[PDB]
């Protein structure tokens, strides 16, 4: 198998990933994340999820560009974190 | 012989740095940017500038965490770019 992103389903059929839960110790390599996020996104499409949300603390921003390469864009940012989203259907 | 960050002086005595300008070909190493940013801020602080605003296209987000390590925080982030800031007047 492969990387468990610990996605939380919301009431609108969407799914949320927080990097503070997934990589609590800030030890996760960006390329490995890209690989896990790519595989997760493929899975979440074929189960008819509506959207994916990625919440990324500022010091963990290494995860943004690889997410972006997969379609994610900025929704908003607080001073110390950002939230990215990918619309699915 | 420090790296030129190609800062743009605004009308309020602050500096804008735009990664679309500084690294148009998307070839600049994140660590090299950090070292250059650090030095640039020393210079800007010494010359009494107001603040720094960093504009960073989304695919170039490797530059954020290093900026953050020097005290920058998000100002705004939407769509395919984000903006970071560091207030210099203490």
Curated annotation (Swiss-Prot), chain A:
<comment type="function">
    <text>May contribute to the regulation of cell proliferation.</text>
</comment>
<comment type="subunit">
    <text>Monomer and homodimer.</text>
</comment>
<protein>
    <recommendedName>
        <fullName>Nucleoside diphosphate-linked moiety X motif 6</fullName>
    </recommendedName>
</protein>
<comment type="similarity">
    <text>Belongs to the Nudix hydrolase family.</text>
</comment>
UniProtKB/Swiss-Prot annotation, chain B:
<comment type="similarity">
    <text>Belongs to the Nudix hydrolase family.</text>
</comment>
<comment type="subunit">
    <text>Monomer and homodimer.</text>
</comment>
<protein>
    <recommendedName>
        <fullName>Nucleoside diphosphate-linked moiety X motif 6</fullName>
    </recommendedName>
</protein>
<comment type="function">
    <text>May contribute to the regulation of cell proliferation.</text>
</comment>
